[PDB]
């Protein structure tokens, strides 16, 4: 009659706290359930509903990263003593009066600052982060190199993965695999272009929560990477200014060589081929017309410039040569360096990145784009796209678009013709 079975392959959509598996800023020594191997259990005739924009895993990844980032800086040097009037000449070489280890004497010291880190007071400058936030110097021992982590379900939970390849980020998926842990995802911080992570299997896929709503970010996942060579050519030296009892400020000392602009080198042909595929897909998603790429109009750095974390330095690149193009040999993108970084759109906090002593060279992979549409009535048969959005959850949403977390509910009842003796 009523018979109970235990261990049935039944699940419900649910959220749960996830844990990860794999000195670094994202710890990684605590995230040491150590990854064995994936199980990839393919479920015959199982369909499921996925929605990358309602994915709780994205919200947890964002929360874990910010709490780790802040936890790692908790014991680091505060730079409060630097919010004094600076006497700046020429990047600027600035001097100031700072209390020394014995707090009755004051030293006159020198340090450089990049122009983007200082603001005129009205040669009289202050650090920009003296009226809105408390500036903390990151400890020189902390690596900012992304190390992939894998999100793992607790024992009573499982992660379903969508293997449809051309999945649009929302709706039914008819090829579902069950795993305990996700692929490794590098917590890369970037804007405008998506770096590293993972490429599409076949075609460039353009996803959007809604293509007619210009307030939503269009996420473009490439099926081929573009390699970018970023350099900060100056031959630096590091200087250390005591600011207290066992505490010091790391700054840049005299430049050994000549001053040269930071820049990134992208192959022109590779970029053109990348755009042709993007254009073909936008043409399919909208309604033929032409595609115009253009420059972002936000004006200010951080909003309109591409950003990278390269060796620990923060680059802002003027990616206009990549988008000033209408569709029916290298490109050199100049970059600026900034030391005071509001990573994550936080209020009341700021980080000072210590300078790096040597020459910096990075090689990164462009694996995607974050684009927005130019709204308004179209007056021709064209649509205009610009780099945009900038919400960091969009970066993580892209990497996690394939996963859903479900709760296993192994106990249940089914009919028969049975009675206990």
């Amino acid at each position: 009659w009523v018979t109970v079975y235990y261990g049935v392959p039944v699940w419900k959509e649910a959220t749960t706290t996830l844990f990860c598996a794999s000195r670094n800023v994202w710890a990684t020594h605590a995230c040491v359930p150590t990854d064995p191997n994936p199980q990839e259990v393919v479920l015959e005739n199982v369909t499921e509903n996925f929605n990358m924009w309602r994915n709780n895993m994205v919200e947890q990844m964002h929360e874990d990263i910010i709490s780790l980032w802040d936890q790692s800086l908790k014991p680091c040097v505060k730079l409060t003593p630097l919010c004094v009037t600076l006497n700046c000449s020429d990047i600027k070489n600035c001097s100031f009066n700072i209390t020394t280890n014995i707090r009755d004497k004051v030293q006159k010291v020198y340090a450089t600052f990049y122009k983007l880190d200082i603001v005129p007071i009205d040669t009289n400058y202050r650090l920009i982060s003296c009226n809105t936030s408390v500036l903390t110097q990151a400890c020189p021992k902390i690596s900012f190199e992304p190390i992939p982590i894998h999100y793992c379900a607790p024992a009573g939970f499982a992660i379903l993965k969508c293997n449809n390849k051309t999945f649009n980020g929302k709706g039914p998926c008819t090829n579902v695999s069950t795993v305990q842990c996700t692929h490794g995802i590098r917590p890369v911080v970037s804007t405008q272009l998506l770096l590293n992570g993972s490429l599409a299997e076949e075609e460039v896929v353009i996803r959007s929560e809604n293509f007619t709503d210009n307030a939503k970010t269009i996420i473009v996942q490439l099926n081929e990477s573009v390699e970018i060579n970023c350099t900060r050519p100056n031959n630096n030296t590091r200087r250390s200014i005591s600011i207290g009892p066992g505490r010091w400020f790391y700054t840049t000392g005299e430049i050994i060589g000549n001053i040269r602009q930071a820049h990134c080198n992208i192959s022109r042909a590779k970029w053109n081929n990348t755009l042709q595929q993007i254009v073909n897909k936008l043409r399919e998603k909208f309604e033929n017309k032409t595609i115009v790429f253009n420059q972002p109009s936000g004006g200010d750095p951080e909003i309109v410039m591409h950003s990278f974390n390269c060796g620990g330095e923060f680059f802002y690149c003027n990616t206009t040569q990549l988008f000033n193009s209408t569709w029916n040999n290298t490109i050199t993108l100049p970059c600026r360096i900034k030391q005071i970084i509001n990573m994550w759109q936080e209020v009341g906090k700021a980080m000072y990145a210590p300078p790096i002593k040597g020459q910096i060279r990075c090689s990164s992979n462009i694996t995607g784009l974050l684009l927005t549409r130019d709204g308004g009535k179209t007056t021709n048969n064209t649509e205009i796209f610009r780099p945009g959005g900038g919400d960091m959850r969009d970066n993580w949403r892209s990497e996690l678009y394939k996963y859903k977390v479900v709760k296993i509910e192994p106990l249940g009842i089914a009919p028969t013709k049975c009675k206990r003796r």
Partner: antibody, heavy 123, light 101 residues
Amino acid sequence: QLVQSGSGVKKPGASVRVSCWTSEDIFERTELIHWVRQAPGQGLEWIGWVKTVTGAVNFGSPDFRQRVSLTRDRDLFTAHMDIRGLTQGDTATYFCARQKFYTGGQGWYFDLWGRGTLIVVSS
Amino acid sequence: EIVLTQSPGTLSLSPGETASLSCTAASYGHMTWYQKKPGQPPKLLIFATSKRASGIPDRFSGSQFGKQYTLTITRMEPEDFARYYCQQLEFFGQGTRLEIR
């Protein structure tokens, strides 16, 4: 709610700085701050929006994209509209309004509107 | 523009009667409706085609008919003889008005 800058008169070619602001509780729950224009005798025209988190912007047409700078201040819980190159055709009441975080497909809808700043451009 | 044409332009109604306001789109996104009085900012009535904003009575409702979206105002009160507009994302319609018969 949504406190706004007062009205005034500008000569053609002048710039105007229109602003609005709110409480921490409202600003923190807003995804976008929109600006909407209403010329005397006309209906409503959308000008543009500013994301409160990233500072990203968008516009109703090139006639605004090339003249109107839209910004936000996340420490002060304010927003601004700087209109350069004012002409007589820009006489209108200018409203700020907010869009709460919403999912795609729900459409745009603005629960809260400011009172409207009146800008007159005249010789 | 060919999107969000509204009609009737002017509706001469008696108090207690029902207004019928139509907005036709060139595309299908959900429609949003507002009420306006001279000297005042508009008030949100309906959004996502049929949902109502807090503070809005059950006099106000709406629905979808393909690309046609409508707003119904029943048991109309004197306070409802206002200007109304439809919105579809970035566009607003011309607007219509209700007046006392």
